[PDB]
């Protein structure tokens, strides 16, 4: 009778119960040339096994492995029987129709759930802050999207997608730290540098100014202690790493930066709603957590927009879980209880029932 909320990401699964204010479980979205191993349990071996991410750039690409992720979610993480709980799943914006169908099939035919629903991640994010109109910047481990939303409706023709997110930032930080005179190359070292990125990185308000300062004053230098007591020093890498979001050429990419994709997304919407979008720029996902990103986005969009434009960047402290939180709220609304796809409805119509209800 209590619904489940499972926010499946490129790097992390966030899972829990509708009505809770936070996910009960958050674990790596990984499965271990001897098979079923998942999450922290996928580190049964990084030897006879290597780690596999079933979800790439926000999209499920391996269904056998995804079933393992969900098995682990139900039985090992939440300790519930799937047959006894309606399950709210999340999906990336622009998720192929065939994918949503396949998710529905699996939850009914493999897991025998009594009911389910697929909700768009960015819409849930916006909804967590009590909004129904806004443009969401959603950036996790694999992918980043701009999703403009008006009165509860995502506008697909205006959705922007950049395949650049947290894991690329970690790898870049490994590289420029290695260029500093350190050596970060292994998968275990990648985790250490994720942790450095998460603790010490920030977004500079003016990048070229911060670069001159760096080479001069040393009050931008910070120290970090490796697992065996070696302490290392990090300087301009702190802000060069997430600068990549605004300048993807740092990573050898020739796509628009995150400010430009936000502007492009807004320019693809009807002129009449653009003001609403500029005044409701909402950030969600782990890769929006950098100190200074909100101020920097404000400055960049100000530069692109008409000089009279009122611009507001909303970045909640609970940003990192706002998709999940939004799902928890949605799943417990009385007016949502109609929207669940029941097992009977799946029996009547097939998997394609998702389109007419999600």
């Amino acid at each position: 009778t209590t619904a489940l909320v499972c926010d499946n990401g490129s790097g992390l699964v966030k899972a829990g119960f509708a009505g809770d204010d936070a996910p009960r479980a958050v674990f790596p979205s990984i499965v271990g040339r001897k098979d079923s191993y998942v999450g922290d349990e996928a580190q049964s071996k990084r030897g006879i096994l290597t780690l596999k991410y079933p979800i790439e750039h926000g999209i499920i690409t391996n269904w056998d492995d995804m079933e393992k992720i969900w098995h682990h979610t139900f039985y090992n993480e939440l300790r519930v029987a799937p047959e006894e709980h309606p399950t709210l799943l999340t999906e990336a914006p622009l998720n192929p129709k065939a994918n949503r169908e396949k998710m529905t099939q699996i939850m009914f035919e493999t897991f025998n759930v009594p009911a389910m629903y697929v909700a768009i991640q960015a819409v849930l994010s916006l909804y967590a802050s009590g909004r129904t109109t806004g443009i969401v910047l959603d950036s996790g481990d694999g992918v980043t999207h701009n999703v403009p939303i008006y009165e509860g409706y995502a506008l697909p023709h205006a959705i922007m997608r950049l395949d650049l997110a947290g894991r690329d930032l970690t790898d870049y930080l490994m590289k420029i730290l290695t260029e500093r005179g350190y050596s970060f190359v292994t998968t275990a070292e990648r985790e250490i540098v994720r942790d450095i990125k998460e603790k010490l990185c920030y977004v500079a308000l003016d990048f070229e100014n911060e670069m001159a300062t760096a080479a001069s004053s040393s009050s931008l230098e910070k120290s970090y202690e490796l697992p065996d007591g070696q302490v290392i020093t990090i300087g301009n890498e702190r802000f060069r790493c997430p600068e990549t979001l605004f300048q993807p050429s740092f990573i050898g990419m020739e796509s628009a930066g995150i400010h430009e994709t936000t502007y492009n997304s807004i320019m693809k919407c009807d002129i009449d709603i653009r003001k609403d979008l500029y005044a409701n720029n909402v950030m969600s996902g782990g890769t929006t957590m950098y100190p200074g990103i909100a101020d920097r986005m404000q400055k960049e969009i100000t530069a692109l927009a008409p000089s009279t434009m009122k611009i507001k960047i909303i970045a909640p402290p609970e940003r990192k879980y706002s998709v999940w939180i939004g799902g928890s709220i949605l799943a417990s609304l009385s007016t949502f209880q109609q929207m669940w796809i029941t097992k009977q409805e799946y029996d009547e119509a097939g998997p394609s029932i998702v389109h007419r209800k999600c």
Partner: protein, 413 residues
């Protein structure tokens, strides 16, 4: 002379002018105020207006719709498009040889003669090539003679087929003829002639039509869906899988395998099965018309990186260095290769400096992957592995302050 015009007035300047005058009077009677207004602005500002008409398509959809120059473009184009000829007609105009990728002077303007060496060089350069043409130009119904303006040593003699939009009009004393180029040029023959004491090259040219959607991606998408809906159906079990495995694949393993010389260095049953299934998916419904497609490519495809100082096309030397290296050459992709029916810039590749504008002959292997919902957004046309492209011509344009290149190219297999 005759009650009906010829297909070619040749040197009959006087009948050509008289005829085009009557035709200008007649056509003026069918233009609305806005079309007349557009024509009037054309006479005042032809060069800029024509320039805009050549590169218009390459920006963000939203940058195009908000350029005010778009009104003049559309209104002028409607005026031309309205008056379509009911049988073929031949036209004459001068071009710079640079236009056909001959980046030297055929002769200086002070010279009277053209060497046999320049002639053969020119013939070798412009032979067996479709050259894409865009934008408004003023053409002549008669061959220029003693007393006409003759700005270059290259005269084009072009046969325009029936239904070509053509706008005759008067500007001060002169009778002029406006067309909007929307086709490729084949030079069937060159000959050296003499006009008023000087040798000129005369290019006998004809036209090849291709569907070119440019920025009208909606039209493009309708067209593709309409021709590749059944394709979804006629695919087999593995094909549908291997293609989707490529599609939300996967292309990276397949293509690196292809680039590596995998099949003939490090065979793989699973991937070799996959390459051949996809190829067979593209032979299923071959491209049902001549089609222009666009690919924004990464510098690596042309042996550059994002930091190569040779990729700074804002310096004219690097454009020249690029031409010498690629212009005229054929170019091979051992990998399967992705293109779009649309020409507009997009966020995913906003900063790529090199655009391949590819001519695809009817019946070529390939498919509109975007009729298959789900990755139908790239308005994507997938071309077969091992495809070769002849680079006919390199152009440059400004996107903001950044110089980018358009590679006029042709699929030759």
């Amino acid at each position: 002379a005759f009650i009906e015009r010829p297909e070619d007035f040749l040197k009959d300047k006087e009948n050509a002018i008289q005829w085009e005058k009557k035709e200008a009077e007649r056509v003026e009677k069918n233009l609305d105020t806005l079309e007349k207004e557009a024509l009037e602005l054309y006479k005042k500002d032809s060069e800029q207006i024509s320039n805009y008409s050549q590169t218009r398509q390459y920006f963000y959809d939203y940058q195009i719709e908000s350029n005010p120059r778009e009104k003049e473009y559309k209104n002028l184009r409607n005026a031309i498009s309205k008056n379509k000829i009911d049988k073929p007609i031949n036209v004459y105009y001068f071009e710079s040889p640079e236009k056909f990728a001959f980046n030297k002077e055929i002769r200086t303007e002070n010279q009277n003669e053209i060497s046999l060496e320049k002639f053969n060089e020119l013939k070798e350069t412009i032979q067996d090539k479709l050259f894409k043409q865009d934008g408004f130009k003023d053409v002549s119904l008669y061959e220029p003679g003693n007393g006409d303006e003759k700005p270059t040593p290259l005269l084009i003699h072009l046969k325009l087929p029936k239904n070509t939009g053509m706008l005759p009009y008067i500007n001060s004393n002169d009778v002029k003829t406006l067309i909007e180029q929307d086709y490729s040029i084949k030079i069937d023959k060159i000959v050296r002639i003499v006009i008023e004491g000087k040798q000129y090259i005369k290019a006998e040219a004809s036209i090849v039509n291709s569907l070119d959607f440019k920025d009208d991606v909606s039209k493009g998408d309708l067209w593709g869906k309409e021709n590749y809906s059944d394709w979804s159906n006629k695919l087999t079990p593995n094909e549908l899988a291997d293609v989707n495995d490529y599609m939300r694949g996967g292309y990276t393993a397949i293509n690196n395998y292809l680039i590596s010389n995998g099949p003939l260095n490090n065979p793989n049953p699973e991937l070799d099965s996959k390459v051949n299934n996809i190829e067979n998916a593209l032979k299923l419904t071959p491209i049902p018309s001549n089609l222009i497609v666009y690919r924004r490519s990464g510098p690596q495809e042309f042996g550059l990186t994002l930091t190569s100082p040779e990729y700074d096309f804002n310096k004219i030397e690097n454009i020249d260095a690029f031409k010498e290296k690629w212009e005229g050459k054929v170019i091979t992709y051992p990998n399967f290769i992705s293109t779009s029916i649309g020409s507009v810039n997009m966020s995913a590749f906003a900063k790529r400096k090199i655009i391949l504008r590819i001519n695809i002959p009817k019946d070529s292997p390939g498919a509109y992957l975007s009729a298959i919902p789900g990755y139908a957004g790239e308005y994507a046309v997938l071309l077969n592995h091992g495809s070769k492209f002849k680079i006919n011509k390199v152009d440059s344009y400004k996107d903001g302050t950044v110089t980018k290149l358009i590679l006029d190219a042709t699929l030759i297999n």
